[PDB]
Amino acid sequence: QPLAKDKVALLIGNMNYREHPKLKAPLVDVYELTNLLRQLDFKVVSLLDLTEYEMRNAVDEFLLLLDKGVYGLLYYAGHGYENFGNSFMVPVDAPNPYRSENCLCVQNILKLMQEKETGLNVFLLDMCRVTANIVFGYATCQGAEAFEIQHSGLANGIFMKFLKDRLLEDKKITVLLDEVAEDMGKCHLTKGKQALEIRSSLSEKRALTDPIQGTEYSAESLVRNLQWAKAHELPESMCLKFDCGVQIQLGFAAEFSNVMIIYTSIVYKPPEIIMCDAYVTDFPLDLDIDPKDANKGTPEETGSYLVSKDLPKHCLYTRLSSLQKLKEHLVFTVCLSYQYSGLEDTVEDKQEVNVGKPLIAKLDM
Ligand SMILES: CC(C)(N)CC(=O)N[C@@H]1COc2ccccc2N(Cc2ccc(-c3ccccc3-c3nnn[nH]3)cc2)C1=O
Fold it and tell me: Where on this chain is Nuclear export signal (motif)?
């Protein structure tokens, strides 16, 4: 009987704090929740390491998708702050000490969610310390150095560990979150360290597994919804042919909506060319790359650990992790060094590549 007009989700994970301890769990947690929600037919946007401005802009764009009957899920994992009975999401650029004005107020987002006529609105916070059918989950796990454990790096946070084991169930969201709360209560490590409070104003039997009804996008909501659904689409693979005859294959992969991996490999070397090597350079300055971190022999050397299963071997890898900062088309240079058989000189050739505005860059931020 219950139907969703559409299913949208925004997941934010903050790890690389400029003035606060770096977190490791949001990377794996946001990555695993993204896949789980996509299996439930949600159109997901996942963003890693956002500033105060970037966080406010992403939340505003997500709030704009919440039309009548739509199911929306917002997930935040990172540093949290509590002050005067209010809770705040701490962006990566927050100065030390914490100031409320530099953070996103959770209660204020809840207030904006209450004004929507959503079929379901799930807001989950995983922090380190008229009806809209709002189900609010508030997990607090202040620590990492407070447990004594030498963690895996690719290890899951406490909330996500139990959440991922139950999210795919066809059960009312409030009943499902109550089971996660019970699971955490059974875990002895959690005692006095983790906490979870569920607040709910859900007056009807709604679940994340509910089917999508007559979607029927309105006039002004059309572009917004198509753009959100397409921020998961990668640029297609390309084969670049150089003047000397050498062919380079350029491939693309994604960890998050703002993290893309570019890989290159020499697919054809004419017999006249004795030796050649290709590399990528001159990326837009807003991305803050540094050649000492690009063109690596393995994806792990670039800071990429999550999509090694989908990455072809024997390539050179580059990780672009600040795609949300891209204001224009992604234009870069593919450089080729080559030598003719019987010649001593090394020749240099280069061509520019324009892959448009990929993933999160499609959104009008
Ligand atoms: C908001 C958040 C992150 N969902 C809250 C949360 O769940 N916090 C818990 C607290 O510590 C745990 C206690 C029990 C089980 C799992 C965890 N993990 C997982 C984890 C912890 C540390 C590291 C790590 C590994 C190498 C180097 C540095 C760190 C590091 N140092 N500090 N943070 N990461 C990796 C994963 C948590 O992150």
Answer: 33-40
Residues having CB closer than 6 A to ligand 1 are: 23-26, 29, 77-78, 126-128, 141, 143-144, 147, 151, 153, 155, 157-159, 189
Which H/E stretch holds residue 44?
A: strand 43-48
Contact of 170 with 209, CB cutoff 8 Å:
yes
Other C-beta atoms within 10 Å of 280: how many? 23
**Residue 157 in tokens:** 């946070």
Q: What technique determined this structure?
A: X-ray
Tell the residue nearest (CA) to atom 17 of ligand 1: 157
Distance 170 CA to ligand 1 centre (A): 29
- Of the candidates 235, 231, 325, 256, the one whose C-alpha atom is nearest the C-alpha of residue 8 is 231
Active site residues: 79, 128
C-alpha span between 355 and 238 (Å, rounded): 10
Gap from CA of 144 to ligand 1 centroid (Å): 5
How far is the centre of ligand 1, averaged over its atoms, from the C-alpha of 100 (Å)?
24
3-state helix, strand, coil in the chain (%, to 5): 25, 30, 45
List the one residue out of 18, 113, 6 whose CA is nearest residue 70.
6
H/E run at residue 176: helix 173-186
Distance CA 23, CA 17 (A): 8
Q: Resolution of the experimental model in angstroms, please?
A: 3.1
Full set of structural domains in the chain with CATH: 1-228 (3.40.50.1460), 229-365 (2.60.40.3360)
Side-chain half-sphere exposure of 230, counting CA atoms within 13 A: 13
